[PDB]
């Protein structure tokens, strides 16, 4: 079998994407720097940094990969929250109890998993990178 190293500087690649996208406003169904949503930001990040094709849907991203327990989160895992009007919101865990996401209140931003709003609404996590 293959013994090539894989999955790489995951944190630095996500931070590269964040550097270029920080502050981009929230727009439902958007996919550009003029405006992007939470699942769209996850889709773009995984395409551009990891070469993986994800759907632009929190509902479908919840099905991906394998489930991870909250205690076992690793950088690059998708974090899912029962938040907002439809009860669906996704971000990318970046370690140290932080996650990056396209937020409705602030656009693309880094938030803490311990912020009371997000801590109360955390639902599940998915691992996509082996």
Curated annotation (Swiss-Prot):
<comment type="pathway">
    <text>Cell wall biogenesis; cell wall polysaccharide biosynthesis.</text>
</comment>
<keyword id="KW-0449">Lipoprotein</keyword>
<keyword id="KW-0961">Cell wall biogenesis/degradation</keyword>
<dbReference type="GO" id="GO:0008234">
    <property type="term" value="F:cysteine-type peptidase activity"/>
</dbReference>
<keyword id="KW-0564">Palmitate</keyword>
<dbReference type="GO" id="GO:0004175">
    <property type="term" value="F:endopeptidase activity"/>
</dbReference>
<dbReference type="GO" id="GO:0071555">
    <property type="term" value="P:cell wall organization"/>
</dbReference>
<keyword id="KW-0788">Thiol protease</keyword>
<comment type="function">
    <text>A murein DD-endopeptidase with specificity for D-Ala-meso-diaminopimelic acid (mDAP) cross-links. Its role is probably to cleave D-Ala-mDAP cross-links to allow insertion of new glycans and thus cell wall expansion. Functionally redundant with MepM and MepH. Also has weak LD-carboxypeptidase activity on L-mDAP-D-Ala peptide bonds. Partially suppresses a prc disruption mutant.</text>
</comment>
<keyword id="KW-0472">Membrane</keyword>
<dbReference type="GO" id="GO:0009254">
    <property type="term" value="P:peptidoglycan turnover"/>
</dbReference>
<keyword id="KW-0998">Cell outer membrane</keyword>
<keyword id="KW-0378">Hydrolase</keyword>
<dbReference type="GO" id="GO:0045227">
    <property type="term" value="P:capsule polysaccharide biosynthetic process"/>
</dbReference>
<dbReference type="GO" id="GO:0106415">
    <property type="term" value="F:muramoyltetrapeptide carboxypeptidase activity"/>
</dbReference>
<dbReference type="GO" id="GO:0009279">
    <property type="term" value="C:cell outer membrane"/>
</dbReference>
<feature type="active site" description="Proton acceptor">
    <location>
        <position position="89"/>
    </location>
</feature>
<feature type="active site">
    <location>
        <position position="101"/>
    </location>
</feature>
<comment type="subunit">
    <text>Monomer.</text>
</comment>
<keyword id="KW-0645">Protease</keyword>
<feature type="active site" description="Nucleophile">
    <location>
        <position position="38"/>
    </location>
</feature>
<keyword id="KW-0732">Signal</keyword>
<protein>
    <recommendedName>
        <fullName>Murein DD-endopeptidase MepS/Murein LD-carboxypeptidase</fullName>
        <ecNumber>3.4.-.-</ecNumber>
        <ecNumber>3.4.17.13</ecNumber>
    </recommendedName>
</protein>
<dbReference type="GO" id="GO:0006508">
    <property type="term" value="P:proteolysis"/>
</dbReference>
<dbReference type="GO" id="GO:0000270">
    <property type="term" value="P:peptidoglycan metabolic process"/>
</dbReference>
<feature type="domain" description="NlpC/P60">
    <location>
        <begin position="8"/>
        <end position="129"/>
    </location>
</feature>
<comment type="similarity">
    <text>Belongs to the peptidase C40 family.</text>
</comment>
């Amino acid at each position: 079998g293959s013994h090539m190293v894989r999955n790489v500087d995951v944190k630095s690649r996500i931070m590269d994407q964040y550097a270029d996208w920080k502050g981009v406003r929230y727009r439902l169904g958007g996919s550009t720097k003029k405006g992007i949503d939470s699942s769209g930001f996850v889709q773009r990040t995984f395409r551009e940094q990891f070469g993986l094709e994800l759907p632009r849907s929190t509902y479908e991203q919840q099905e991906m990969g394998k489930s991870v327990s909250r205690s076992n989160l690793r950088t690059g895992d998708l974090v899912l929250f029962r938040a907002g009007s439809t009860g669906r919101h996704v971000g990318i865990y970046i370690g140290n109890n932080q996650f990056v996401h396209a937020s409705t209140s602030s656009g693309v931003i880094i938030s803490s998993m311990n912020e009371p709003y997000w801590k109360k609404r955390y639902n599940e996590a998915r691992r996509v990178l082996s």
